[PDB]
Symmetry: none
Subunit: 98 residues, 2 copies
Amino acid sequence: ETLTERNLDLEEKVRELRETVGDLEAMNEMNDELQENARETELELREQLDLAAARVREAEKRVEAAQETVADYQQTIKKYRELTAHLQDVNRELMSQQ
Amino acid sequence: MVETLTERNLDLEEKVRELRETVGDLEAMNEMNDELQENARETELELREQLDLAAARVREAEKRVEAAQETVADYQQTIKKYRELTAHLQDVNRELMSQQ
């Protein structure tokens, strides 16, 4: 009769555990779905990041180009102003010789 | 049946052992996911940072470009004028030289 008390006690514990396993499974299942979506969102980001990383010196090169092109012009100017001076000196000197 | 019934009891003691183990594994699996979720969230955030940094770097450089492009146009004009002038002086000097 006792063995029966102990036996019924156990049939409960099984029912209890089966329920708990069901919940754990379900919870784990649900998280897996989220984790799936997280993995794809990341993969998306990584793609967007590579596009931007490209755009960044596609641009930081364009900047260098221009910055060089200006320095070139400052030199070209610096030279024209030397030249013009020089031609003025010559002209002036020619005029006095008249 | 205190012989045929201890059989039933022994049967059950196994089922609990089996289930306890299973739960253990489920717990550990769950734990594992928690670790993944934390890494995911931090890696996602790290990326979002990196994206904003780049987006900034781009806009900034693209305006540095625009600055120069303006500065250059100014210089082209200044040059265009010096070139005209230079011509003009040459014409005047050449013509003066022939007259002596």
